[PDB]
PDB file of C-alpha atoms in Angstrom:
ATOM      1  CA  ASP A 924    -165.716 -47.122   6.348  1.00  0.00           C
ATOM      2  CA  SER A 925    -166.005 -44.737   3.345  1.00  0.00           C
ATOM      3  CA  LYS A 926    -165.053 -41.773   5.542  1.00  0.00           C
ATOM      4  CA  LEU A 927    -161.658 -43.431   6.403  1.00  0.00           C
ATOM      5  CA  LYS A 928    -158.936 -44.124   3.809  1.00  0.00           C
ATOM      6  CA  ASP A 929    -158.624 -47.813   3.215  1.00  0.00           C
ATOM      7  CA  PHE A 930    -154.996 -48.857   3.459  1.00  0.00           C
ATOM      8  CA  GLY A 931    -155.680 -52.399   2.920  1.00  0.00           C
ATOM      9  CA  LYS A 932    -154.351 -55.489   4.823  1.00  0.00           C
ATOM     10  CA  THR A 933    -150.808 -55.685   6.342  1.00  0.00           C
ATOM     11  CA  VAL A 934    -148.887 -57.066   9.115  1.00  0.00           C
ATOM     12  CA  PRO A 935    -147.789 -54.583  11.742  1.00  0.00           C
ATOM     13  CA  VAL A 936    -144.018 -55.239  12.882  1.00  0.00           C
ATOM     14  CA  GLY A 937    -143.358 -52.720  15.519  1.00  0.00           C
ATOM     15  CA  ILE A 938    -145.095 -50.757  18.080  1.00  0.00           C
ATOM     16  CA  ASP A 939    -143.925 -48.102  20.671  1.00  0.00           C
ATOM     17  CA  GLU A 940    -145.172 -44.980  22.538  1.00  0.00           C
ATOM     18  CA  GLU A 941    -143.385 -41.764  21.657  1.00  0.00           C
ATOM     19  CA  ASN A 942    -144.602 -38.282  22.933  1.00  0.00           C
ATOM     20  CA  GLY A 943    -148.074 -39.471  23.750  1.00  0.00           C
ATOM     21  CA  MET A 944    -148.323 -41.182  20.424  1.00  0.00           C
ATOM     22  CA  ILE A 945    -148.123 -44.859  19.663  1.00  0.00           C
ATOM     23  CA  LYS A 946    -146.033 -45.336  16.549  1.00  0.00           C
ATOM     24  CA  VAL A 947    -146.649 -48.341  14.358  1.00  0.00           C
ATOM     25  CA  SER A 948    -144.409 -49.711  11.667  1.00  0.00           C
ATOM     26  CA  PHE A 949    -145.855 -52.358   9.194  1.00  0.00           C
ATOM     27  CA  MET A 950    -144.230 -54.819   6.656  1.00  0.00           C
ATOM     28  CA  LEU A 951    -142.524 -53.611   3.555  1.00  0.00           C
ATOM     29  CA  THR A 952    -143.343 -49.833   3.853  1.00  0.00           C
ATOM     30  CA  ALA A 953    -140.719 -48.109   5.697  1.00  0.00           C
ATOM     31  CA  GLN A 954    -143.259 -45.415   6.860  1.00  0.00           C
ATOM     32  CA  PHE A 955    -144.356 -44.924  10.349  1.00  0.00           C
ATOM     33  CA  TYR A 956    -148.086 -44.632  11.131  1.00  0.00           C
ATOM     34  CA  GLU A 957    -149.450 -43.335  14.451  1.00  0.00           C
ATOM     35  CA  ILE A 958    -152.603 -43.713  16.722  1.00  0.00           C
ATOM     36  CA  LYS A 959    -153.516 -41.661  19.803  1.00  0.00           C
ATOM     37  CA  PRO A 960    -153.653 -43.697  22.946  1.00  0.00           C
ATOM     38  CA  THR A 961    -157.285 -42.773  23.952  1.00  0.00           C
ATOM     39  CA  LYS A 962    -159.854 -44.846  25.664  1.00  0.00           C
ATOM     40  CA  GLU A 963    -161.495 -44.938  22.352  1.00  0.00           C
ATOM     41  CA  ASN A 964    -158.524 -46.536  20.614  1.00  0.00           C
ATOM     42  CA  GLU A 965    -157.661 -48.956  23.268  1.00  0.00           C
ATOM     43  CA  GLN A 966    -158.929 -51.805  21.465  1.00  0.00           C
ATOM     44  CA  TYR A 967    -157.471 -50.825  18.114  1.00  0.00           C
ATOM     45  CA  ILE A 968    -154.257 -50.650  19.826  1.00  0.00           C
ATOM     46  CA  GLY A 969    -154.479 -54.015  21.481  1.00  0.00           C
ATOM     47  CA  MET A 970    -155.237 -55.599  18.190  1.00  0.00           C
ATOM     48  CA  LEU A 971    -152.152 -54.015  16.822  1.00  0.00           C
ATOM     49  CA  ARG A 972    -149.833 -55.128  19.689  1.00  0.00           C
ATOM     50  CA  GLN A 973    -151.340 -58.674  19.457  1.00  0.00           C
ATOM     51  CA  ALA A 974    -150.645 -58.618  15.552  1.00  0.00           C
ATOM     52  CA  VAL A 975    -146.995 -57.396  16.024  1.00  0.00           C
ATOM     53  CA  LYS A 976    -146.422 -59.978  18.581  1.00  0.00           C
ATOM     54  CA  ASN A 977    -147.729 -62.761  16.239  1.00  0.00           C
ATOM     55  CA  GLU A 978    -146.675 -61.355  13.045  1.00  0.00           C
ATOM     56  CA  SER A 979    -150.431 -61.589  11.865  1.00  0.00           C
ATOM     57  CA  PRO A 980    -152.272 -59.344   9.673  1.00  0.00           C
ATOM     58  CA  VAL A 981    -154.863 -56.911  10.346  1.00  0.00           C
ATOM     59  CA  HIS A 982    -156.887 -54.354   8.088  1.00  0.00           C
ATOM     60  CA  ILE A 983    -155.957 -50.775   8.461  1.00  0.00           C
ATOM     61  CA  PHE A 984    -158.289 -47.700   7.972  1.00  0.00           C
ATOM     62  CA  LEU A 985    -156.383 -44.145   8.016  1.00  0.00           C
ATOM     63  CA  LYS A 986    -157.696 -40.464   8.788  1.00  0.00           C
ATOM     64  CA  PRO A 987    -157.659 -39.246   5.314  1.00  0.00           C
ATOM     65  CA  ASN A 988    -154.445 -37.348   4.172  1.00  0.00           C
ATOM     66  CA  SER A 989    -152.481 -38.681   7.026  1.00  0.00           C
ATOM     67  CA  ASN A 990    -150.432 -41.367   8.547  1.00  0.00           C
ATOM     68  CA  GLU A 991    -152.879 -41.537  11.527  1.00  0.00           C
ATOM     69  CA  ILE A 992    -154.728 -44.725  12.038  1.00  0.00           C
ATOM     70  CA  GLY A 993    -158.473 -44.287  12.530  1.00  0.00           C
ATOM     71  CA  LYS A 994    -159.685 -47.936  12.756  1.00  0.00           C
ATOM     72  CA  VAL A 995    -158.230 -51.492  12.902  1.00  0.00           C
ATOM     73  CA  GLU A 996    -160.246 -54.483  11.865  1.00  0.00           C
ATOM     74  CA  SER A 997    -159.624 -58.202  11.955  1.00  0.00           C
ATOM     75  CA  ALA A 998    -158.055 -60.113   9.066  1.00  0.00           C
ATOM     76  CA  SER A 999    -159.944 -62.943   7.434  1.00  0.00           C
ATOM     77  CA  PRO A1000    -158.574 -66.600   7.602  1.00  0.00           C
ATOM     78  CA  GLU A1001    -157.828 -66.142   3.829  1.00  0.00           C
ATOM     79  CA  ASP A1002    -155.926 -63.112   4.788  1.00  0.00           C
ATOM     80  CA  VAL A1003    -153.913 -65.058   7.515  1.00  0.00           C
ATOM     81  CA  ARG A1004    -153.202 -67.831   5.164  1.00  0.00           C
ATOM     82  CA  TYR A1005    -152.143 -65.395   2.418  1.00  0.00           C
ATOM     83  CA  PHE A1006    -149.815 -63.567   4.582  1.00  0.00           C
ATOM     84  CA  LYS A1007    -148.288 -66.573   5.937  1.00  0.00           C
ATOM     85  CA  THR A1008    -147.305 -67.665   2.453  1.00  0.00           C
ATOM     86  CA  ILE A1009    -145.676 -64.475   1.148  1.00  0.00           C
ATOM     87  CA  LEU A1010    -143.979 -63.373   4.715  1.00  0.00           C
ATOM     88  CA  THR A1011    -142.311 -66.840   5.149  1.00  0.00           C
ATOM     89  CA  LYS A1012    -139.738 -68.679   7.146  1.00  0.00           C
ATOM     90  CA  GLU A1013    -139.173 -70.810   3.906  1.00  0.00           C
ATOM     91  CA  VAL A1014    -135.637 -69.813   2.689  1.00  0.00           C
ATOM     92  CA  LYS A1015    -135.524 -70.048  -1.233  1.00  0.00           C
ATOM     93  CA  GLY A1016    -132.007 -69.612  -2.697  1.00  0.00           C
ATOM     94  CA  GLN A1017    -131.295 -67.839  -5.929  1.00  0.00           C
ATOM     95  CA  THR A1018    -131.845 -70.328  -8.828  1.00  0.00           C
ATOM     96  CA  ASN A1019    -129.296 -69.164 -11.417  1.00  0.00           C
ATOM     97  CA  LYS A1020    -125.586 -69.083 -10.354  1.00  0.00           C
ATOM     98  CA  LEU A1021    -123.770 -65.640 -10.064  1.00  0.00           C
ATOM     99  CA  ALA A1022    -120.585 -64.532  -8.598  1.00  0.00           C
ATOM    100  CA  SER A1023    -121.080 -63.476  -4.971  1.00  0.00           C
ATOM    101  CA  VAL A1024    -117.800 -61.441  -5.042  1.00  0.00           C
ATOM    102  CA  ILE A1025    -116.955 -58.682  -7.301  1.00  0.00           C
ATOM    103  CA  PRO A1026    -113.286 -59.113  -8.627  1.00  0.00           C
ATOM    104  CA  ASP A1027    -111.882 -55.501  -7.990  1.00  0.00           C
ATOM    105  CA  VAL A1028    -112.792 -51.988  -7.035  1.00  0.00           C
ATOM    106  CA  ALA A1029    -112.903 -50.867 -10.815  1.00  0.00           C
ATOM    107  CA  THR A1030    -115.810 -53.291 -11.279  1.00  0.00           C
ATOM    108  CA  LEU A1031    -117.426 -52.165  -8.195  1.00  0.00           C
ATOM    109  CA  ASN A1032    -117.168 -48.648  -9.346  1.00  0.00           C
ATOM    110  CA  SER A1033    -118.568 -49.861 -12.936  1.00  0.00           C
ATOM    111  CA  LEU A1034    -121.538 -51.260 -11.074  1.00  0.00           C
ATOM    112  CA  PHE A1035    -122.014 -48.203  -8.961  1.00  0.00           C
ATOM    113  CA  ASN A1036    -122.117 -46.191 -12.284  1.00  0.00           C
ATOM    114  CA  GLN A1037    -124.609 -48.538 -13.810  1.00  0.00           C
ATOM    115  CA  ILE A1038    -126.748 -48.095 -10.971  1.00  0.00           C
ATOM    116  CA  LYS A1039    -126.674 -44.534 -10.696  1.00  0.00           C
ATOM    117  CA  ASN A1040    -127.164 -44.248 -14.529  1.00  0.00           C
ATOM    118  CA  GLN A1041    -130.586 -45.735 -13.781  1.00  0.00           C
ATOM    119  CA  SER A1042    -131.890 -42.979 -11.557  1.00  0.00           C
ATOM    120  CA  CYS A1043    -135.047 -41.345 -12.200  1.00  0.00           C
ATOM    121  CA  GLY A1044    -134.209 -37.762 -13.514  1.00  0.00           C
ATOM    122  CA  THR A1045    -131.208 -38.958 -15.559  1.00  0.00           C
ATOM    123  CA  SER A1046    -131.292 -39.275 -19.255  1.00  0.00           C
ATOM    124  CA  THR A1047    -129.233 -42.442 -19.125  1.00  0.00           C
ATOM    125  CA  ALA A1048    -131.965 -44.153 -17.304  1.00  0.00           C
ATOM    126  CA  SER A1049    -134.492 -46.749 -18.653  1.00  0.00           C
ATOM    127  CA  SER A1050    -137.936 -47.481 -17.436  1.00  0.00           C
ATOM    128  CA  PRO A1051    -138.839 -47.977 -14.817  1.00  0.00           C
ATOM    129  CA  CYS A1052    -136.000 -45.919 -13.390  1.00  0.00           C
ATOM    130  CA  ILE A1053    -134.990 -46.156  -9.906  1.00  0.00           C
ATOM    131  CA  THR A1054    -136.625 -43.552  -7.784  1.00  0.00           C
ATOM    132  CA  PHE A1055    -133.513 -42.514  -5.608  1.00  0.00           C
ATOM    133  CA  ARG A1056    -134.727 -38.788  -5.663  1.00  0.00           C
ATOM    134  CA  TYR A1057    -137.841 -40.000  -3.800  1.00  0.00           C
ATOM    135  CA  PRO A1058    -136.713 -41.207  -0.494  1.00  0.00           C
ATOM    136  CA  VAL A1059    -140.109 -41.167   1.412  1.00  0.00           C
ATOM    137  CA  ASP A1060    -140.619 -44.802   0.715  1.00  0.00           C
ATOM    138  CA  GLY A1061    -139.694 -47.671  -1.562  1.00  0.00           C
ATOM    139  CA  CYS A1062    -136.356 -48.442  -0.476  1.00  0.00           C
ATOM    140  CA  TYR A1063    -137.114 -52.378  -0.921  1.00  0.00           C
ATOM    141  CA  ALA A1064    -138.024 -51.735  -4.568  1.00  0.00           C
ATOM    142  CA  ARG A1065    -134.940 -49.578  -5.107  1.00  0.00           C
ATOM    143  CA  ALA A1066    -132.753 -52.198  -3.538  1.00  0.00           C
ATOM    144  CA  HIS A1067    -134.096 -55.039  -5.560  1.00  0.00           C
ATOM    145  CA  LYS A1068    -133.683 -53.307  -8.920  1.00  0.00           C
ATOM    146  CA  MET A1069    -130.080 -52.411  -7.965  1.00  0.00           C
ATOM    147  CA  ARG A1070    -129.465 -56.053  -7.467  1.00  0.00           C
ATOM    148  CA  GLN A1071    -131.081 -56.933 -10.694  1.00  0.00           C
ATOM    149  CA  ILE A1072    -128.506 -54.548 -12.420  1.00  0.00           C
ATOM    150  CA  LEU A1073    -125.706 -56.487 -10.586  1.00  0.00           C
ATOM    151  CA  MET A1074    -127.350 -59.737 -11.839  1.00  0.00           C
ATOM    152  CA  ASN A1075    -127.282 -58.413 -15.196  1.00  0.00           C
ATOM    153  CA  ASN A1076    -123.513 -58.195 -14.918  1.00  0.00           C
ATOM    154  CA  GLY A1077    -123.138 -61.795 -13.600  1.00  0.00           C
ATOM    155  CA  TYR A1078    -123.188 -60.947  -9.973  1.00  0.00           C
ATOM    156  CA  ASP A1079    -125.251 -61.339  -6.613  1.00  0.00           C
ATOM    157  CA  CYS A1080    -125.093 -59.501  -3.505  1.00  0.00           C
ATOM    158  CA  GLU A1081    -126.617 -59.174   0.011  1.00  0.00           C
ATOM    159  CA  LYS A1082    -129.152 -56.772   1.388  1.00  0.00           C
ATOM    160  CA  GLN A1083    -128.688 -55.079   4.653  1.00  0.00           C
ATOM    161  CA  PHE A1084    -131.747 -54.038   6.428  1.00  0.00           C
ATOM    162  CA  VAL A1085    -131.363 -51.574   9.337  1.00  0.00           C
ATOM    163  CA  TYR A1086    -134.208 -50.872  11.580  1.00  0.00           C
ATOM    164  CA  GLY A1087    -135.249 -48.395  14.426  1.00  0.00           C
ATOM    165  CA  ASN A1088    -136.403 -44.742  14.720  1.00  0.00           C
ATOM    166  CA  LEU A1089    -134.783 -43.794  11.449  1.00  0.00           C
ATOM    167  CA  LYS A1090    -134.348 -40.336   9.808  1.00  0.00           C
ATOM    168  CA  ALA A1091    -132.616 -39.325   6.796  1.00  0.00           C
ATOM    169  CA  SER A1092    -131.940 -35.901   4.916  1.00  0.00           C
ATOM    170  CA  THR A1093    -131.748 -35.232   1.320  1.00  0.00           C
ATOM    171  CA  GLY A1094    -129.818 -32.084   2.181  1.00  0.00           C
ATOM    172  CA  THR A1095    -132.888 -30.055   1.730  1.00  0.00           C
ATOM    173  CA  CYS A1096    -135.604 -32.141   3.419  1.00  0.00           C
ATOM    174  CA  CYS A1097    -135.942 -35.023   5.889  1.00  0.00           C
ATOM    175  CA  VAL A1098    -137.834 -38.318   5.887  1.00  0.00           C
ATOM    176  CA  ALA A1099    -138.541 -40.660   8.860  1.00  0.00           C
ATOM    177  CA  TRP A1100    -138.439 -44.421   8.471  1.00  0.00           C
ATOM    178  CA  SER A1101    -138.868 -47.482  10.414  1.00  0.00           C
ATOM    179  CA  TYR A1102    -136.389 -49.381   8.469  1.00  0.00           C
ATOM    180  CA  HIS A1103    -134.140 -48.977   5.425  1.00  0.00           C
ATOM    181  CA  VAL A1104    -132.455 -51.384   2.982  1.00  0.00           C
ATOM    182  CA  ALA A1105    -129.866 -51.219   0.353  1.00  0.00           C
ATOM    183  CA  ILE A1106    -127.370 -53.780  -1.446  1.00  0.00           C
ATOM    184  CA  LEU A1107    -124.387 -54.758   0.387  1.00  0.00           C
ATOM    185  CA  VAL A1108    -121.863 -55.736  -2.267  1.00  0.00           C
ATOM    186  CA  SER A1109    -118.763 -57.907  -1.639  1.00  0.00           C
ATOM    187  CA  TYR A1110    -115.627 -57.159  -3.727  1.00  0.00           C
ATOM    188  CA  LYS A1111    -111.803 -57.935  -3.577  1.00  0.00           C
ATOM    189  CA  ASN A1112    -109.691 -55.145  -2.555  1.00  0.00           C
ATOM    190  CA  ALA A1113    -106.112 -54.518  -3.937  1.00  0.00           C
ATOM    191  CA  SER A1114    -104.747 -57.276  -1.966  1.00  0.00           C
ATOM    192  CA  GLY A1115    -107.345 -59.832  -2.790  1.00  0.00           C
ATOM    193  CA  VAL A1116    -109.254 -59.507   0.682  1.00  0.00           C
ATOM    194  CA  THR A1117    -113.008 -59.461   0.526  1.00  0.00           C
ATOM    195  CA  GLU A1118    -114.376 -56.106   1.647  1.00  0.00           C
ATOM    196  CA  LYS A1119    -117.944 -55.040   1.574  1.00  0.00           C
ATOM    197  CA  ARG A1120    -119.782 -51.662   0.681  1.00  0.00           C
ATOM    198  CA  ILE A1121    -123.378 -50.529   0.584  1.00  0.00           C
ATOM    199  CA  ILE A1122    -124.551 -48.932  -2.666  1.00  0.00           C
ATOM    200  CA  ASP A1123    -127.315 -46.576  -2.111  1.00  0.00           C
ATOM    201  CA  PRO A1124    -127.635 -43.490  -4.353  1.00  0.00           C
ATOM    202  CA  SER A1125    -130.843 -42.358  -2.312  1.00  0.00           C
ATOM    203  CA  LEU A1126    -128.183 -41.362   0.408  1.00  0.00           C
ATOM    204  CA  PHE A1127    -124.848 -41.312  -1.142  1.00  0.00           C
ATOM    205  CA  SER A1128    -124.477 -39.914  -4.567  1.00  0.00           C
ATOM    206  CA  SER A1129    -120.554 -40.177  -4.770  1.00  0.00           C
ATOM    207  CA  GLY A1130    -120.135 -43.950  -4.791  1.00  0.00           C
ATOM    208  CA  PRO A1131    -120.131 -47.114  -2.493  1.00  0.00           C
ATOM    209  CA  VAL A1132    -119.878 -46.364   1.274  1.00  0.00           C
ATOM    210  CA  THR A1133    -119.080 -48.667   4.281  1.00  0.00           C
ATOM    211  CA  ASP A1134    -122.185 -50.029   5.948  1.00  0.00           C
ATOM    212  CA  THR A1135    -121.236 -48.090   9.046  1.00  0.00           C
ATOM    213  CA  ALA A1136    -121.537 -44.809   7.271  1.00  0.00           C
ATOM    214  CA  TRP A1137    -124.839 -45.900   5.700  1.00  0.00           C
ATOM    215  CA  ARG A1138    -126.424 -46.605   8.907  1.00  0.00           C
ATOM    216  CA  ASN A1139    -125.313 -43.444  10.332  1.00  0.00           C
ATOM    217  CA  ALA A1140    -126.975 -41.659   7.645  1.00  0.00           C
ATOM    218  CA  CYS A1141    -130.168 -43.243   8.704  1.00  0.00           C
ATOM    219  CA  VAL A1142    -129.941 -41.654  11.986  1.00  0.00           C
ATOM    220  CA  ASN A1143    -129.524 -38.011  11.057  1.00  0.00           C
ATOM    221  CA  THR A1144    -130.266 -36.229  14.176  1.00  0.00           C
ATOM    222  CA  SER A1145    -130.527 -32.943  12.397  1.00  0.00           C
ATOM    223  CA  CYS A1146    -133.895 -34.204  11.487  1.00  0.00           C
ATOM    224  CA  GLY A1147    -134.963 -35.124  14.990  1.00  0.00           C
ATOM    225  CA  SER A1148    -134.743 -38.006  17.371  1.00  0.00           C
ATOM    226  CA  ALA A1149    -133.190 -41.062  15.867  1.00  0.00           C
ATOM    227  CA  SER A1150    -131.619 -44.354  16.666  1.00  0.00           C
ATOM    228  CA  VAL A1151    -130.814 -47.746  15.317  1.00  0.00           C
ATOM    229  CA  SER A1152    -132.298 -50.808  17.194  1.00  0.00           C
ATOM    230  CA  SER A1153    -130.972 -53.544  14.762  1.00  0.00           C
ATOM    231  CA  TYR A1154    -129.585 -54.549  11.335  1.00  0.00           C
ATOM    232  CA  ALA A1155    -129.545 -57.871   9.605  1.00  0.00           C
ATOM    233  CA  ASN A1156    -127.612 -58.906   6.487  1.00  0.00           C
ATOM    234  CA  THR A1157    -129.647 -61.308   4.113  1.00  0.00           C
ATOM    235  CA  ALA A1158    -129.098 -63.045   0.727  1.00  0.00           C
ATOM    236  CA  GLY A1159    -129.599 -60.490  -2.008  1.00  0.00           C
ATOM    237  CA  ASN A1160    -132.870 -62.221  -3.152  1.00  0.00           C
ATOM    238  CA  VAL A1161    -134.767 -61.341  -0.034  1.00  0.00           C
ATOM    239  CA  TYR A1162    -136.985 -58.411  -0.945  1.00  0.00           C
ATOM    240  CA  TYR A1163    -138.064 -57.586   2.625  1.00  0.00           C
ATOM    241  CA  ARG A1164    -137.038 -59.115   6.100  1.00  0.00           C
ATOM    242  CA  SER A1165    -139.354 -58.468   8.945  1.00  0.00           C
ATOM    243  CA  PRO A1166    -138.171 -57.981  12.525  1.00  0.00           C
ATOM    244  CA  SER A1167    -139.011 -61.549  13.256  1.00  0.00           C
ATOM    245  CA  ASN A1168    -136.721 -62.718  10.402  1.00  0.00           C
ATOM    246  CA  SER A1169    -139.465 -63.634   8.117  1.00  0.00           C
ATOM    247  CA  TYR A1170    -138.610 -63.130   4.393  1.00  0.00           C
ATOM    248  CA  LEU A1171    -140.675 -61.874   1.659  1.00  0.00           C
ATOM    249  CA  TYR A1172    -139.640 -62.516  -2.034  1.00  0.00           C
ATOM    250  CA  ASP A1173    -140.215 -60.781  -5.425  1.00  0.00           C
ATOM    251  CA  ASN A1174    -138.359 -63.246  -7.548  1.00  0.00           C
ATOM    252  CA  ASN A1175    -139.663 -61.592 -11.007  1.00  0.00           C
ATOM    253  CA  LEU A1176    -139.440 -58.056  -9.910  1.00  0.00           C
ATOM    254  CA  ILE A1177    -143.229 -57.813 -10.401  1.00  0.00           C
ATOM    255  CA  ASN A1178    -143.727 -55.887  -7.063  1.00  0.00           C
ATOM    256  CA  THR A1179    -140.290 -53.794  -7.730  1.00  0.00           C
ATOM    257  CA  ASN A1180    -141.160 -52.622 -11.089  1.00  0.00           C
ATOM    258  CA  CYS A1181    -144.842 -51.831 -10.020  1.00  0.00           C
ATOM    259  CA  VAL A1182    -143.605 -49.688  -7.185  1.00  0.00           C
ATOM    260  CA  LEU A1183    -140.769 -47.952  -9.244  1.00  0.00           C
ATOM    261  CA  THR A1184    -143.425 -47.109 -11.882  1.00  0.00           C
ATOM    262  CA  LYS A1185    -145.931 -45.790  -9.140  1.00  0.00           C
ATOM    263  CA  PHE A1186    -143.156 -43.431  -7.790  1.00  0.00           C
ATOM    264  CA  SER A1187    -141.647 -42.639 -11.028  1.00  0.00           C
ATOM    265  CA  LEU A1188    -142.565 -38.944 -11.109  1.00  0.00           C
ATOM    266  CA  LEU A1189    -142.163 -38.308  -7.446  1.00  0.00           C
ATOM    267  CA  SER A1190    -139.432 -36.412  -6.039  1.00  0.00           C
ATOM    268  CA  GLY A1191    -138.178 -34.928  -2.578  1.00  0.00           C
ATOM    269  CA  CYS A1192    -139.798 -35.638   0.752  1.00  0.00           C
ATOM    270  CA  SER A1193    -143.402 -35.177  -0.535  1.00  0.00           C
ATOM    271  CA  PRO A1194    -146.060 -36.722  -0.820  1.00  0.00           C
ATOM    272  CA  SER A1195    -145.938 -38.456   2.674  1.00  0.00           C
ATOM    273  CA  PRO A1196    -147.438 -40.840   3.106  1.00  0.00           C
ATOM    274  CA  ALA A1197    -146.257 -42.207  -0.143  1.00  0.00           C
ATOM    275  CA  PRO A1198    -149.151 -43.221  -2.810  1.00  0.00           C
ATOM    276  CA  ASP A1199    -150.856 -46.523  -2.370  1.00  0.00           C
ATOM    277  CA  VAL A1200    -148.911 -49.477  -3.820  1.00  0.00           C
ATOM    278  CA  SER A1201    -150.981 -52.244  -2.430  1.00  0.00           C
ATOM    279  CA  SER A1202    -152.433 -53.151  -5.902  1.00  0.00           C
ATOM    280  CA  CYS A1203    -148.738 -54.148  -6.929  1.00  0.00           C
ATOM    281  CA  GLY A1204    -148.948 -57.778  -6.401  1.00  0.00           C
ATOM    282  CA  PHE A1205    -146.179 -60.657  -6.704  1.00  0.00           C
TER     283      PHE A1205
END
């Protein structure tokens, strides 16, 4: 209805009960949404539970200015068909050939610098800049844009998706996430042995870090309760991976650039929830 905020259609991917609240996660967005387990909400909650089970879409209405779900409606058959097409079990490899392994640490560091130079809030960056300074949401777009920079240099990489009750701190404020993603880059060390590091300037400004260290930064207990439930490594071209191992792609960065543009001026841990990006297509 008009009193509720239309979030649009999405596929819920997780549901749990924490502190008398039902916490729901959705595809692509890293934000949690909540719904109170009241008698009035029992059917909405059931619709969500079944949709999580089956990875099927629903239509979400939010209480205004909040992450609280006020209503859940069924998705159309056109919706079901549409979501099955974009959130797929069809695996599509990267078409143009690139080197999957960076030749040395010096080149890894060069790549890190090129990526960090594209941060929103730096004079070196070109539009759309990468919105590292806005950790609330958009990890998926930041990671895909980071990958593009590697590809501009003739390299590909992996993604690592980590999932759970995640919390991270900028040093001055906290965000909560249902998942996070960054690029996982393979490079040859001094002895020619392949090692991997995450690059993620939204969490580590200094340089590439181990994935172990990066996942730890996603469970920052100074922010509240946090834990990891899973992680998965994927091909770099995967834009988003669901907890059911379905893939979403963004091969022309249509979605990536749209999201980065939408968040371009945002910084810190507000606004939360992040602005609507449902209009960004693929």
